[PDB]
Nucleic acid binder design. Structure first.
Ligand SMILES: [Zn+2]
Ligand SMILES: [Zn+2]
Lengths: 160, 154
DNA sequence: GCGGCTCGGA
DNA sequence: GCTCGGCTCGGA
């Protein structure tokens, strides 16, 4: 029962952007930055095509959010991403000072929001970013499993 | 290989003065691959409305365009300031070979100070670290920006 | 040594 | 794994 402007509502737009990365032969990850139930930034992985090692879905949304906000600080915003953020994106989330990150499926190998580490809730950091996970995880995992050529029942098998 | 660390750090300090002229954090970075400059950068986050426009990110982005590849193997990144969590993570994704910074970020540094994400176990890539290159001149720029005495920083 | 310190929500 | 390798792009 997904209501408009719910976590699943925004995650489905983020999943629609992940299909764009899939069509572009990239890692099928999409991201949507939401502030007061309004989209201020969208993005998907374009690193291979743009020759940008930082062109992850979360970065493309944060850069767009800063332009839309005319401010490199994006307080009280919520970032939706289909994949658990890496160290790069989680570190960028701290600098933009967003309010929460909502991701779908986990990166059990190198995830930096609970999996390999938790840089967002690291002690000593200038800002703490709240974490919500599991939103449409089955649909986010299906996209990446087909990209990485893996059956779904092996992606994060220890959590199942 | 060819040039010395102080040679390239002198170039990175020149770029940090450009960020200083732009009323930004005076941090500059130069990306070197096979003793040739493939990327330059300085902090431009306030002017570009970019939360990621750190010196290292702008230098790495430029390197990816020059190399037409989002992977920048065997390159060495020079920066006047210890990389943050965001910038250190970008070096892992770019798969650079070494990061050389001058002064340390004792508060939130992610290359030895607050943490070491470059040498974290479990990561796909390990980035070597060299520090202290022209540390006095890198610290002077940030101390004057942060309005702090030199004998307090670190 | 403006406030309080690694941009001003450091 | 109506079987590409080896698994969280192919230097995963
Ligand atoms: Zn990322
Ligand atoms: Zn940085």
């Amino acid at each position: 029962s997904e209501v408009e402007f719910s976590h699943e509502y925004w995650m489905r737009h983020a999943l629609a952007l992940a299909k764009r990365a899939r069509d572009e032969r990239e890692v099928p990850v999409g991201a949507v930055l939401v502030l007061n139930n309004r989209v201020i930034g969208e993005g998907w992985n374009r690193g291979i095509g743009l020759h940008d090692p930082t062109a992850h879905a979360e970065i493309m949304a944060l850069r767009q959010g800063g332009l839309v906000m005319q401010n490199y600080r994006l307080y009280d915003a919520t970032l939706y991403t289909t994949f658990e953020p890496c160290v790069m994106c989680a570190g960028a989330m701290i600098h933009s000072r967003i309010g929460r990150v909502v991701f779908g499926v986990r990166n059990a190998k190198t995830g930096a929001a609970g999996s390999l580490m938790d840089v967002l809730h690291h002690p000593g950091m200038n800002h703490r970013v709240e974490i919500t996970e599991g939103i449409l995880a089955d649909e986010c995992e299906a996209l990446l499993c087909r990209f990485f050529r893996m059956p779904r029942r092996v992606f994060n098998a220890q959590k199942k």
